Design a protein around this ligand. Structure first.
Ligand SMILES: [Mg+2]
Lengths: 97, 40, 109, 43
């Protein structure tokens, strides 16, 4: 069901699946190609930038050592886990710590 | 010996001429993100 | 004379196996969960809570992941870890049954 | 075009559709520096 075509419900029914927006504090897999080391894909805590004019993936400069990255024009992938099973394992196994 | 109708087509060009060392064939990187390979 | 194929040979379905559980005193694997096993336990419990939601955790949390983590930490998780040791040609499947309520959890919180 | 030509090379069946994958729910953008973010945080 859509959310714009469905506005007659006071609350939700138990068992439903809600596809909510990504918020600050969510974990995300963050990758740069080529992936040579196994630290090339790491899990970071998302900080959502409220500025509508920002279109870049910002990270601390000390975090570039994981990905062998720099800011001369590199592009990096990012996918946010949504499944509970994949979201658990991102926090416990794939965290950049 | 003065005919050109049945001459070899490939002979009008300049006559004459396993892994490519400079080809990224076993490197799986998207072609739209090739700037990550810049020497910088 | 090696003759034409018969029905005795040519079976595709593998024969069924008998689960041989090593006794507790004769176990060799470690009494400590690996990070892989702890992560799998927490993920499975979180997904099942997202399905059912019935838990005996005394505290209250608003996420299946947190509830699963606290269940593992409080040793109240309804799961077992079966470590497949060997599949014997005669049919037996020797495994190890470990209880995560009496093993050391490697996670941190 | 042949059935077995689909297999071998990098753009073949094995290395492009099986060993690799096109996925949904993924994003790409240029990276940037931000000294106010933690090492385990991404803007
Ligand atoms: Mg670069």
């Amino acid at each position: 069901h859509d959310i714009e075509g469905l506005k007659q419900d006071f609350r939700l029914e138990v068992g439903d699946i809600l596809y909510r927006d990504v918020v600050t504090g969510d974990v995300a897999f963050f990758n740069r190609q080529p992936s040579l080391e196994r630290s090339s894909i790491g899990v970071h805590r998302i900080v959502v930038l409220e500025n509508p004019k920002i279109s870049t993936f910002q990270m601390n400069v000390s975090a570039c050592a994981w990905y062998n990255a720099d800011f001369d024009g590199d592009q990096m992938n990012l996918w946010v886990p949504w499944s509970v099973m994949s979201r658990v394992e991102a926090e416990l196994l794939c965290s950049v710590r | 010996g003065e005919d050109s109708s049945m001459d070899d087509i490939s002979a009008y060009s300049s006559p004459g001429l396993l892994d490519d060392p400079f080809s990224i064939e076993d490197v799986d990187i998207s072609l739209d993100v090739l700037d990550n390979l810049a020497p910088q | 004379i090696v003759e034409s194929p018969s029905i005795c040979e040519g079976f595709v379905q593998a024969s069924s196996q008998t689960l041989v559980i090593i006794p507790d005193n004769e176990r060799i694997t470690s009494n400590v969960l690996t990070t892989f096993e702890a992560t799998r336990l927490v993920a499975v419990r979180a997904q099942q809570l997202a399905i059912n939601g019935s838990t005996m955790l005394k505290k209250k949390y608003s996420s299946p992941i947190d509830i699963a983590k606290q269940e593992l930490f409080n040793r109240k998780i309804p799961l077992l870890v079966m470590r497949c040791i060997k599949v014997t040609p005669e049919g037996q499947k020797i495994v190890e049954i470990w209880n995560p309520r009496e093993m050391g959890i490697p996670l941190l919180d | 075009p042949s059935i077995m030509r689909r297999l071998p090379r990098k753009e073949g069946r094995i290395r492009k559709s099986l060993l690799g994958s096109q996925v949904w729910s993924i994003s790409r953008s240029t990276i940037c520096g931000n000294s106010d973010l933690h090492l385990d945080e991404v803007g």
